[PDB]
Amino acid sequence: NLAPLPPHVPEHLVFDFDMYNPSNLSAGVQEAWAVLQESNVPDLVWTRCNGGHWIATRGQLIREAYEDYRHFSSECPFIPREAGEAYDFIPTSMDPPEQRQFRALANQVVGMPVVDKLENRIQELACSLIESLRPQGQCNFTEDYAEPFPIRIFMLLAGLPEEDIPHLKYLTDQMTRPDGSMTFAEAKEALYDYLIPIIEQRRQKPGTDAISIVANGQVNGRPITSDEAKRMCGLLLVGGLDTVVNFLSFSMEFLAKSPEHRQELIERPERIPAACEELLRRFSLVADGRILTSDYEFHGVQLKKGDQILLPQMLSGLDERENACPMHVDFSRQKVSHTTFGHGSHLXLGQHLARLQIIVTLKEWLTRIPDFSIAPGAQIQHKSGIVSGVQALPLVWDPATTKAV
Ligand code: HEM
Ligand SMILES: CC1(C)[C@@H]2CC[C@@]1(C)C(=O)C2
Ligand SMILES: [K+]
Fold first, then answer.
1. Ligand 3 center to 184 CA (angstroms)
2. What start-end ranges are recorded for coiled-coil regions in this protein?
3. How many CA atoms lie within 13 A of 86 on its CB side?
4. 3-class secondary structure, 51
5. How many CA atoms lie within 13 A of 385 on its CB side?
6. Which ligand is nearest to the CA of 84?
């Protein structure tokens, strides 16, 4: 239900948006969140859902809050409070000064030099999967590509067996879009239960994989601890298993529904990177937040120490104050403004990997299957959370229109 309204919150600021089951979900997730930017809604609102918390609804406030880590701490970055309290991943649960030293280590395993080394295998995997689907004239895109394409690459990078994917994917999903079977704390402890023996093993006998690299790594010139390594490796798993996996499906749902936009990319494939950026804006999908370190008056609103504030990364690029006609996809948009990969000191460090995976998927798919549609009669369902997603995406095409390459 709705948590009782705290005394310090004026009733005129109440807007009971449920980030885990938003009212207008049937219209699309981004559409469902964009209700927070309707004409009657203030820049900063209180929702009584999910224990009660603030929501910044506009790009300007979201950006300002991500910059001000002194007032807006990452210590408790998830809603609901019990999830944010249990959340201890590194670097995300940390503020400067201590946070930054951990970013360099994470960059060693998923940063640009690593992405370069993996790029041929990434390309190869996309081609392999797509060629196998091509003659079928149909797929369940979420499970036939959106999942295995990013996840098998992450498993390879981390040196984990592919048979472990269903278990790990289940756990990650419970931390971002819980189905009610597990609390965040339970899913976290299970993920750590998995990692503990692996980290011990790889500190004793290091390999070349990501976990070995992190577990035996150094931070600001001193050895990382087993526990710090566990808390970082957990985060890396969530990133590899539950980000681009969802994003690809939003993109592909859009392309199937939009023949005019596909054709643009078939006629002019060099536009694909710009298209990637515009889609990252339009189908932005992350929303986490921060906790107030002290009482603070922010844009005329009295925020109280300990208050949680959702700062939906998703909303910045959908904000008409940041981009004209924001629900329209324009691959030639001149200034594509978004905070899809975050803002401030916690900027996504997986973004080279993410962009490569998106760009590769678009290029390799459109080359082989230029003409495809949503299965006739299908209604695409979505699920909202910390990272939002597509429940299923049945696609169809005429094999005669495809090219084996
Ligand atoms: C479309 C794909 C992705 C999106 C939209 C995305 C989004 C984000 C966002 C919004 C943040 C900031 C969180 C915050 O400020 O609290 C973040 C941080 C982070 N992301 Fe990504 N991400 C994506 C892919 C990836 C991938 C593939 C990885 C690979 C491991 C990854 C690893 C990380 C890490 C390690 C951080 C923490 C940085 C820090 O706290 O200093 N992300 N990401
Ligand atoms: C918000 C994120 C996308 C970012 C990387 C994975 C994620 C769910 C986190 O816990 C930090
Ligand atoms: K915490």
1. 11
2. none
3. 16
4. helix
5. 21
6. 3
